[PDB]
């Protein structure tokens, strides 16, 4: 089997992407944030505290003939941005882009933090990291991908995120029309539960490439590119007037700037992030200070190749017995 679903930016900045997902019988379609940096599929639901729901579409298990309470199971998750959610668990039929998994754990939110409430466009998350990070207790649950894997034509999914435009998540096949040149594969460590890999270096604009190992994670659920302070300083030093602002919470730059590109290495290959992808617009409405899309990972504890980086590439998440990651230009 295979599946193919379109993913759409939630706003004009590509802060996140939503993908329609069918849950239950008859289908209830919710727009979920596919997150290769976590491993829980959770949804706003008929159980979510009413004051914490503000425009989201909810899953109502009592209206699904295939829903079953996973008795005794609870979940609770905290994300890198400080947001969180928790609740109980049902199993139900879940379909993405025509690919169906029966018996998928659907984690029903009883509580969500303010960032989730405030985002009316995101009805929940669908985790695509390794199932070892799944938070369901006392019986840990598998991700949608892990459950689908044995049925897939090939044990892979791909992320093809758009810049200010829709893109695609495919399951079970590589669309050879969706990228240019060849795919360069690189080793993955699953030791922390992430799609963790080592970039071979970087360049700023038309500058020379610096060969240096940068361990980080491929994370579709993080908006920006978070890299070591040395690398980030070298980037922003090429932008007149750019500075790190503790009051704003990162690097800002004059909105009159033209940003240089940023290149990262994948083995001997190179992915170029155009300068425009690094512009996250005014820090507050009408400001002439703009927020940068490349930020320091210092104090996160991990480097994160988030959407800013990933949307410059066609990315293969290879879940074969030895997982790997592939990157191609597009």
Swiss-Prot record:
Keyword Cell inner membrane recorded: no
Residue stretches making up the Peptidase A1 domain: 17-328
Gene Ontology molecular functions: aspartic-type endopeptidase activity
Catalytic EC class: hydrolase
Active site: 35, 199
Keywords: Aspartyl protease, Disulfide bond, Hydrolase, Protease, Signal, Zymogen
Reaction(s) catalysed by this chain's protein: Hydrolysis of proteins with specificity similar to that of pepsin A, prefers hydrophobic residues at P1 and P1', but does not cleave 14-Ala-|-Leu-15 in the B chain of insulin or Z-Glu-Tyr. Clots milk
EC number: 3.4.23.22
Disulfide bonds: 255-290
UniProt KW Secreted keyword: no
Biological-process GO terms, alphabetical: proteolysis
Similarity annotation: Belongs to the peptidase A1 family.
Protein name per the record: Endothiapepsin
Native source species: Cryphonectria parasitica
């Amino acid at each position: 089997s295979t599946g193919s679903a379109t993913t759409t930016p939630i706003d004009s900045l590509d802060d996140a992407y939503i993908t329609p997902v069918q849950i239950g019988t008859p289908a209830q379609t919710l727009n979920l944030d596919f997150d290769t940096g976590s491993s829980d599929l959770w949804v706003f639901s008929s159980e979510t505290t009413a004051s914490e729901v503000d425009g989201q579409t909810i899953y109502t298990p009592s209206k699904s003939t295939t829903a079953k309470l996973l008795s005794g199971a609870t979940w609770s998750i905290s994300y890198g941005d400080g947001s969180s959610s928790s609740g109980d668990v049902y199993t139900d039929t879940v379909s993405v882009g025509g690919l169906t998994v029966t018996g998928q754990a659907v984690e029903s939110a009883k509580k969500v933090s303010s960032s989730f409430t405030e985002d009316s466009t995101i009805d929940g998350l669908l985790g695509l990291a390794f199932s070892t990070l799944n938070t369901v207790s006392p019986t840990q649950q598998k991700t949608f991908f892990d459950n689908a894997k044995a049925s897939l034509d090939s044990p892979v999914f791909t992320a093809d995120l758009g810049y200010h435009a829709p893109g695609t998540y495919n399951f079970g096949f590589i669309d050879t029309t969706a990228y240019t040149g060849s795919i360069t594969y690189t080793a993955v460590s699953t030791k922390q539960g992430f799609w963790e890999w080592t970039s071979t270096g970087y360049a700023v604009g038309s500058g020379t490439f610096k060969s240096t190992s940068i361990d980080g994670i491929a994370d579709t659920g993080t908006t920006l590119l978070y890299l070591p302070a040395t690398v980030v300083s070298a980037y922003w030093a090429q932008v007149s007037g750019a500075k790190s602002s503790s009051s704003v919470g990162g690097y800002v730059f004059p909105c009159s700037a033209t940003l240089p590109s940023f290149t990262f290495g994948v083995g001997s290959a190179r992915i170029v992030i155009p300068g425009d992808y690094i512009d996250f617009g005014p820090i507050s409405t009408g400001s002439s200070s703009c927020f940068g899309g490349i930020q320091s990972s210092a104090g996160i504890g991990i480097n994160i190749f988030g959407d800013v980086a990933l949307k410059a590439a066609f990315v293969v998440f290879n879940g074969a017995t030895t997982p790997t990651l592939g990157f191609a230009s597009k």
